[PDB]
Amino acid sequence: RIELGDVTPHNIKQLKRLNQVIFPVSYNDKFYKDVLEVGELAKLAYFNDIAVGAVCCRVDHSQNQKRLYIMTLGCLAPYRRLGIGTKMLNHVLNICEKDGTFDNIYLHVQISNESAIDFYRKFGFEIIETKKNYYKRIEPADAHVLQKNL
Ligand SMILES: CC(C)(COP(=O)(O)OP(=O)(O)OC[C@H]1O[C@@H](n2cnc3c(N)ncnc32)[C@H](O)[C@@H]1OP(=O)(O)O)[C@@H](O)C(=O)NCCC(=O)NCCS
Ligand SMILES: CNC(=O)[C@H](CC1CCN(C(=O)c2cc(C(C)(C)C)nn2C)CC1)NC(=O)[C@@H]1CCCC(=O)N1
Asked: Which residues are reported to carry the modification Phosphotyrosine?
């Protein structure tokens, strides 16, 4: 019942709308412009052909490593706990497994987001650091850095 589809100029506004409702951070036009250029690293999640979630990633070269950074991964509150997040996370883990050159996968999780910590730890991600004052306009401003070694 869960399918992932490509993000394109035809459905970018559906992605923008989904992110605006799901996430407490507003993303600029450069984020959505970058999204169209990452290809398979950005997907829309459909539940019975209804857009209910999305995943946006970027490649990062830091710590003298090739790293996959998940910027956004989420779905609408009434559709949670159906396997939509797992399908998006498995898709990104599958890109990395096929590619073979990624050292790790990391992301930021606002410290109050207990269900996201639970979700990522279930997949082998670890809290490797807690960045103080990561967010600027939202409370709490601290974010855990979650990382899975590949
Ligand atoms: C975190 C999130 C992405 C998970 O999406 P989801 O579609 O509900 O996840 P799944 O149905 O694939 O859940 C998989 C497993 O994660 C764990 N988990 C997920 N939500 C949980 C919760 N609220 N409490 C406890 N465990 C939870 C469970 O073990 C679950 O397995 P189960 O449902 O078989 O028990 C989702 O809650 C979400 O969209 N959150 C808001 C977005 C956000 O702020 N995330 C920031 C990260 S970028
Ligand atoms: C305020 N930060 C965020 O919203 C981030 C995403 C944000 C996107 C834009 N952006 C970049 O494009 C970026 C990243 C990098 C790396 C790290 C690779 C060097 N380089 N660039 C240019 C910065 C990061 N996501 C979270 O915090 C998630 C979602 C919100 C809820 C939550 O709990 N967690």
From this structure: 106
